[PDB]
Amino acid sequence: YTNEVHAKFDDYDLGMEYARQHNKPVMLDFTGYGCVNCRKMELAVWTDPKVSSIINNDYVLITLYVDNKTPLTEPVKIMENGTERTLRTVGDKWSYLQRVKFGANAQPFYVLIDNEGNPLNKSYAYDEDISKYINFLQTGLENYRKEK
Amino acid sequence: EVHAKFDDYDLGMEYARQHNKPVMLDFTGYGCVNCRKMELAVWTDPKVSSIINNDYVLITLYVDNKTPLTEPVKIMENGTERTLRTVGDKWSYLQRVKFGANAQPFYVLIDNEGNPLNKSYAYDEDISKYINFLQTGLENYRKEK
């Protein structure tokens, strides 16, 4: 018996498909290998037994590392206000999509979504308040359940 | 002639949403002879290539792509455990569970929410039928609108 959050997927498409088959909501965790505040969140909040259970049991966690160096199969040239940028790594890919889809470039950044990508709560960033985080998770969960 | 826009599903889908276009998924392979035959017999047609290049966002999903995933993924399927390790294993698997198909070439036309805009299309070298497939998908897209 050792209650700690287990990161399910790093891959968005496969995580979304698993969640869909298992009728679970998804938590997107935009994070970084060297992200100080992500790690502070992990140690101060994720280690709480109630938070850990909810994330492990009720959500499909997808950890999106914005500093992941894994090469993209081929590079992708994008236009972002207002010049060319070449996306080369998985990390570049996720930094870019966080900005264009959620209007944020910060980590930690948590987004609760349903199986069609609709947000289930407002986003949560860095805040070590355990009960506020629990409210954030339970609210998303109930908004998900109210879809069915 | 037909210029392949994206290999990456998520970035291709976001570009298509930003540009208000439907998406064509092309399940294919580097070593896929029937994919090459289909490209040579049908994509070389001026009207086909014009529709693909101007009206769709093409996403080429190579099922034999060896690029490693960030970390392997264990999957349960029908109903046995398998470990996916490369981008190609990912797209092979997703082709099966999402579209009920395991062969290439396989084409799916989808809207920006991922809803299919037509029956999918497999290997058939009929230019007219392929034009009809594309135009129908395009007509269906423009109707949600």
Side-chain angles (χ1 to χ4, degrees), chain A residues 37-84 86-145:
Chain A
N37 289 330
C38 289
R39 161 90 154 172
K40 294 207 197 175
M41 284 302 280
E42 195 192 8
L43 302 174
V45 174
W46 277 21
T47 56
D48 180 83
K50 180 147 168 195
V51 166
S52 186
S53 289
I54 291 157
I55 294 174
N56 285 341
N57 299 335
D58 300 319
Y59 278 93
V60 172
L61 175 63
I62 307 180
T63 54
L64 303 168
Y65 287 93
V66 308
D67 52 354
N68 183 340
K69 293 306 174 74
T70 301
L72 288 181
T73 290
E74 67 170 351
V76 184
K77 258 143 190 194
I78 63 94
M79 280 282 174
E80 212 187 351
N81 286 185
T83 64
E84 168 267 306
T86 294
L87 311 175
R88 304 184 177 276
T89 66
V90 175
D92 296 339
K93 165 188 174 168
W94 292 113
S95 298
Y96 171 80
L97 294 170
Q98 191 191 359
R99 298 185 305 261
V100 300
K101 302 204 95 198
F102 304 106
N105 76 336
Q107 298 81 40
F109 191 78
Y110 311 97
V111 190
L112 312 178
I113 61 178
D114 72 12
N115 308 298
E116 295 76 38
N118 297 121
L120 291 169
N121 209 342
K122 62 190 157 52
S123 57
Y124 197 103
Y126 175 62
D127 188 340
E128 294 183 355
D129 192 330
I130 294 161
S131 77
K132 195 185 223 288
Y133 201 71
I134 284 163
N135 288 341
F136 158 76
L137 299 172
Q138 293 187 317
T139 290
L141 198 50
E142 202 52 31
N143 294 333
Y144 183 78
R145 285 164 177 175

Side-chain angles (χ1 to χ4, degrees), chain A residues 22-35:
Chain A
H22 292 271
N23 299 129
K24 289 182 176 176
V26 153
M27 172 166 260
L28 299 185
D29 173 13
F30 293 84
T31 186
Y33 297 113
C35 186

Side-chain angles (χ1 to χ4, degrees), chain B residues 72-79 81 83-84:
Chain B
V73 180
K74 303 189 292 173
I75 52 94
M76 202 66 65
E77 193 193 353
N78 231 297
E81 185 192 30
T83 299
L84 313 170

